[PDB]
Amino acid sequence: RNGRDSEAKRLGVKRFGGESVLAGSIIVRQRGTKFHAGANVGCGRDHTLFAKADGKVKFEVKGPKNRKFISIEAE
Amino acid sequence: AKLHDYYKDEVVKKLMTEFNYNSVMQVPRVEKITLNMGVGEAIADKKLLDNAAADLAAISGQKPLITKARKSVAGFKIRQGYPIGCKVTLRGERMWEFFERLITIAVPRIRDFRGLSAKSFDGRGNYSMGVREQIIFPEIDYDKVDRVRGLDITITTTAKSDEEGRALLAAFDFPFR
Amino acid sequence: MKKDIHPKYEEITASCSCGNVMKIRSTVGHDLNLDVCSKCHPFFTGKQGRVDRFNKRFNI
Amino acid sequence: DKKSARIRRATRARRKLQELGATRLVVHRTPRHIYAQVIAPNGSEVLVAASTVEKAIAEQLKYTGNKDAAAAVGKAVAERALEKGIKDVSFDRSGFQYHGRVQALADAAREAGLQF
Amino acid sequence: MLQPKRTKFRKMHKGRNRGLAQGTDVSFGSFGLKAVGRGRLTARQIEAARRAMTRAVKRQGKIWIRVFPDKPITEKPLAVRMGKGKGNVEYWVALIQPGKVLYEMDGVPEELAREAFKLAAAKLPIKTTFVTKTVM
Amino acid sequence: IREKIKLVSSAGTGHFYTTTKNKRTKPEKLELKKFDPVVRQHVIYKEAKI
RNA sequence: UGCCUGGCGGCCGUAGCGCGGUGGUCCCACCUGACCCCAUGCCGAACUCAGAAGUGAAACGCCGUAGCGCCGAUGGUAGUGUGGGGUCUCCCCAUGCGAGAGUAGGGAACUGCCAGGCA
RNA sequence: GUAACGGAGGAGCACGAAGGUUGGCUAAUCCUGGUCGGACAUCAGGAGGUUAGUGCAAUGGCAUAAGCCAGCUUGACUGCGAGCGUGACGGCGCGAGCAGGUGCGAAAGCAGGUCAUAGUGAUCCGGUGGUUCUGAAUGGAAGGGCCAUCGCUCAACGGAUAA
RNA sequence: AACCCGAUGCAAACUGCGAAUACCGGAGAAUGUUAUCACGGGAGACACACGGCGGGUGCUAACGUCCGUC
RNA sequence: GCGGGGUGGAGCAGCCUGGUAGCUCGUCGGGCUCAUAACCCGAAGGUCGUCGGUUCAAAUCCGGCCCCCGCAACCA
Ligand SMILES: [K+]
Ligand SMILES: [K+]
Ligand SMILES: [Mg+2]
Ligand SMILES: [Mg+2]
Ligand SMILES: [Mg+2]
Ligand SMILES: [Mg+2]
Ligand SMILES: [Mg+2]
Ligand SMILES: [Mg+2]
Ligand SMILES: [Mg+2]
Ligand SMILES: [Mg+2]
Ligand SMILES: [Mg+2]
Ligand SMILES: [Mg+2]
Ligand SMILES: [Mg+2]
Ligand SMILES: [Mg+2]
Ligand SMILES: [Mg+2]
Ligand SMILES: [Mg+2]
Ligand SMILES: [Mg+2]
Ligand SMILES: [Mg+2]
Ligand SMILES: [Mg+2]
Ligand SMILES: [Mg+2]
Ligand SMILES: [Mg+2]
Ligand SMILES: [Mg+2]
Ligand SMILES: [Mg+2]
Ligand SMILES: [Zn+2]
């Protein structure tokens, strides 16, 4: 009665901390906001986080809920 | 109005002495009176809920809010969002007028009235009572009554405990057995 | 209060057998005559064996 | 808790303004007083402020907690901002409805020359 | 025969049985029977040992079973080939690591407990040792 | 169950959009203001057969 | 300069709760009215407006207090990369990395900008 | 990223609002009191804190809610697209920003469908509408092209044939 | 005997914790016949085997079977 | 292995497409008869194999567990 699975979706972090990226570059693919958009980072309809400016990827924990945020530090 | 005037003129002084309250703000106040009719029969007939609403309107002097089932219940054969009751919230002047009318006229008109229970406080100083017949209220006309409808009356108070709540009602000489 | 949605509510005179007269706002409109009120009701006013029976009926 | 409800109501717009990096005109309203602060994009520095608790504004007002007082504060905060050279700001109603006193303050600030 | 009343899943990966045990102390009684070897204890084995020690103490004192068989073991029927899906659940085991206190006893003399545990140990596939409660 | 329909421009350009509709639940004709690229204006578009 | 209060932040429990005490000049809150502006699927409860008779009761703030939450070593233990070994379903040795839990202990936040009251 | 006739479940849709935006709101469950009314209806208060909710599986999300209610609406826009993800390829996905025109909002803004991830079918052939293209001597026309769109449980789902 | 409280275990599809490694990026030195990448000519190959380590399956059966990695 | 079942005492419906147990016989009470049968009138009797699951709600849908049928159980 088993024998089924779906195709792997290649989610996860595409650009890690300190990596230089061009504007538009996808930083993380995810289901829901496991990571939240910080400064110079946009959130797509599928919760993809992407660079809105050229710069270095920066991961940070912030706010009362200690949520993880991704920001781009301008070069 | 009169009962509100009475509250300020007499009730506050009696309660202040009784409980040795430090401040007037400590003295219990009647926040609101809510009149509710649970019209289960409404599911069969929509008109019955409308008639119940009209009765509640006449007693309250205020257009009732229709209430609907929070969740589906198989036992009562009700689905969520189906209108099964009506309520009115009385505050300020309208509340005091109703409170007066209830004590002065409606409560005496209750059949075989032997006083109201003093054990009907919820533990937080709020008093709830049920009216078996809408006839007791003078606004309703016995001749034009299609069906006998009861209602449940709750008096919400700022009283911290039942003792403070009963004292407040007693100050107004609310009838208690 | 919202306008045009509520029952007409006006002061009316309520008269009782005891002679207590009360002017109250109501939807009733017409003046009311009451059989009883808080003033005259028995409960409010406070107006509300076998061995004795045997002795009375069969006193010898 | 009315305050907590109001803060919740204010949060979405405040987070948006911070993300935009806008200079913010924050209004606080109490029954007796109204306050206006122009806060820098960082949110930790007040550039200019005006309130009915200030004597200069208060002395000219009959009551500090009405629409006329609100208009006075709006004019005052804007004039001080213009001297500072702020000019462009975003209005933060701070969870209060954009109506009545809050609206009167905003309209006065716009009339004075603050852009929003 | 101990068995979970219900489980989220019917079948379980074989897994491995490495490491030292948790629950290495006598926690409920005076005396305990501790595993010195690694292995699986079937529900039937646990029951056999329980009956042996209970009879030896003649319904005196109290016995605790510290292990519960919550791991389902499947088997394929005879003359079935490989494949065609995982086998059917046949029995339940508890995984035992060295140091695990299997049973505890109280309300009996030590000599009686030692005899009872010896009788129980003869039913078990793992080497065991008698232990007593300690202050620390 | 949902059926394909056309939304036809009121401008007379002949430009159309396509969408689906549940005709049984919603018999009434769908009408929306949509951009007509031919006239380059938002105009009323009215439901028609696909 | 200090104290007190309000607003906006940093920070995100060593910062939160509980418990006890405490504050109204100002501020804040409750509060007083509502024809209004505006509002209630009914209700001036809320929202809103016009105010200031009363009270800090509640709320809130502040202070105290480990019953809690929370933080938390040292040492040991588990695991593990590389190389080697055994009695090899699992371990051991050399070397490097080294938890989790628990223990001692800590802990009743700290801090920036602006405004007002007071000294 | 990763196989097995390994272990477990779902899809082949739905929705003109269940989409956009503005404003507002916050759950389950239990206890106490209350006409009919009971284990369970509606009402009041308390405890509790999402143990609820999310159109539909599971997982990850969600209070600034992504959950719930109301007003106004058609951005479920058209042309494009820096840059990037994922694929042997065909493809598939995310996307600031630009132009035109639009909705909501006082404004900052937000909107190129829906919390996200299933809801699907190449090419050929042919149909329908449109069109500064083509038009076999020439003007037309037919037919073709281009743009929009329609017809496969071709489900053995990269589909040997119409059979 | 629910619930709750104290004590005790268990989990591939539990997580109020959490390594080693591995992987991505940056910098620097030494070493290495550019060991790298792109484009173009020519392929072969797409039956793998055993051993170690981590696992599914099988009986922690198989010189069994199916993956990862050396 | 793949299918079809299990519903008043009996034999059959209802399931598909949840909410809303029928038919014939039998049983019971009354009547007709000298009496019995036949016949006539009136009435009762399955909460759906047995648990679980889903659902506001289960004969109905899902999954066992038991039972009872049918088909299959092969080629060297
Ligand atoms: K095929
Ligand atoms: K291998
Ligand atoms: Mg597979
Ligand atoms: Mg997957
Ligand atoms: Mg896979
Ligand atoms: Mg250490
Ligand atoms: Mg530690
Ligand atoms: Mg591979
Ligand atoms: Mg492979
Ligand atoms: Mg490009
Ligand atoms: Mg052809
Ligand atoms: Mg020609
Ligand atoms: Mg020709
Ligand atoms: Mg053509
Ligand atoms: Mg294929
Ligand atoms: Mg795990
Ligand atoms: Mg490197
Ligand atoms: Mg091949
Ligand atoms: Mg091969
Ligand atoms: Mg291989
Ligand atoms: Mg192996
Ligand atoms: Mg093997
Ligand atoms: Mg082999
Ligand atoms: Zn009287």
CATH number, domain of F19, equals 2.20.28.120
Residues of C in contact with B96 (CB under 8 A): none
Check the annotation: does C16 bind a ligand.
yes
DSSP codes joined into one string, A18-68: T-EE-TT-EEEE-SS-SSEE-TTEEE-TT--EEESSSEEEEEEEETTTTEE
Alpha helix stretches (DSSP H) within chain C: 42-45, 50-57
Question: For residue A67, how far is its CA from the centre of ligand 6 (angstroms)?
Answer: 29
The answer to whether position E11 is within a domain reads no
CA distance C20 to C13: 11
Within the 19-38 window of chain C, which residues sit less than 8 Å (CB to CB) from chain B? 22, 24-28, 32, 34-38
d(CA E116, CA E54): 8
B104–C7 C-beta distance less than 8 A: no
- Tokens 């002047």, residue located: B93
The rounded Cα F19 to chain-centroid distance in angstroms is 8
With b for 16 or more beta-carbon neighbours within 10 A and e for fewer, the E78-116 pattern comes to: eeeeeeeeeeeeebbbbbbbbbbbbbbbbebeeebbbeb
Query: Taking Cα atoms as reference points, which of E17, E29, E10 lies closest to residue E117?
Result: E29
Q: How far apart are the first and last CA of chain B?
A: 26
- Among B62, B103, B116, the residue to mutate for chain C (most C Cβ within 10 A): B62
* CB-strand contact E87/H, under 7 Å: no
CA B134 to chain centre: 12
Note whether residue E81 is domain-resident.
Answer: yes
Nearest CA in chain B to C36: B108
Tell me the nearest-neighbour CA distance from B71 into chain C, angstroms: 29
Ion ligand 24: residues, Cβ under 5 Å:
C 16, 18, 20, 37, 39-40
User: Strands of A12-13's sheet, edge to edge?
Assistant: A12-13, A26-29, A49-51, A41-43
Residue found under tokens 């002061």: C11
Print the SS3 string covering chain E: CCCCCCCCCCCCCCCCCCCCCCCCCCCCCCEEEEECCCEEEEHHHHHHHHHHHHHHHCCCCEEEECCCCCEEEEECCCCCCCCCCCCEEEEEEEEECCCCEEEEEECCCHHHHHHHHHHHHCCCCCCEEEEECCCC
Nearest to C25 among B57, B61, B114 (CB): B61
Do residues D32 and D66 touch, judged by C-beta distance below 8 A?
A: no
Q: Give the CATH number, domain containing residue D33.
A: 3.30.420.100
Provide the residue range defining the domain that includes F31.
Answer: 1-50
Q: For residue D55, give the 3-state DSSP assignment.
A: helix
Going from the Cα of E127 to the center of ligand 21, the distance in angstroms, rounded, reads 27
Q: Which residues of B touch C6 (CB under 8 A)?
A: 57, 61-63
- What φ, ψ does residue E35 adopt, rounded to 5°? -75, 130
Residue with tokens 């046949």: E90
B97 touches chain C (CB under 8 A): yes
Pairing of strands E31-35, F41-49: unpaired
Identify whether the C-beta of residue D86 lies closer than 8 Å to the C-beta of residue D114: yes
Asked if C14 has any chain B CB less than 8 Å from its own CB, the reply is yes
For chain A, the structural domain boundaries read 11-75
Bridging pattern class, strands A67-74 and A36-37: parallel
Number of independent structural domains in chain E: 1
The angle, 0 to 180 degrees and rounded to 10, between the axes of the packed helices E43-57 and E110-121 is 150
Token output for B51: 């008639």
Question: From CA A43, how far away is CA E37, in angstroms rounded?
Answer: 55
SS3 D105: helix
Tell me how far apart the alpha carbons of residues F7 and F44 are, in angstroms, rounded to a whole number. 9
Q: What is the CATH number of the domain that holds E78?
A: 3.90.1170.10
DSSP B73: B
Nearest CA in chain B to C15: B105
- Amino acid identity, position E54: T
User: How far apart, in whole angstroms, are the C-alpha atoms of residue D114 and residue A5?
Assistant: 60
A11: exposed, middle or buried (C-beta count within 10 Å: 0-12, 13-18, 19+)? Answer: middle
Nearest CB among C1, C6, C14 relative to B105 is that of C14
Domains and CATH numbers, chain B: 3-172 (3.30.1440.10)
Per the structure, the count of domains in chain F is 1
Method: cryo-EM
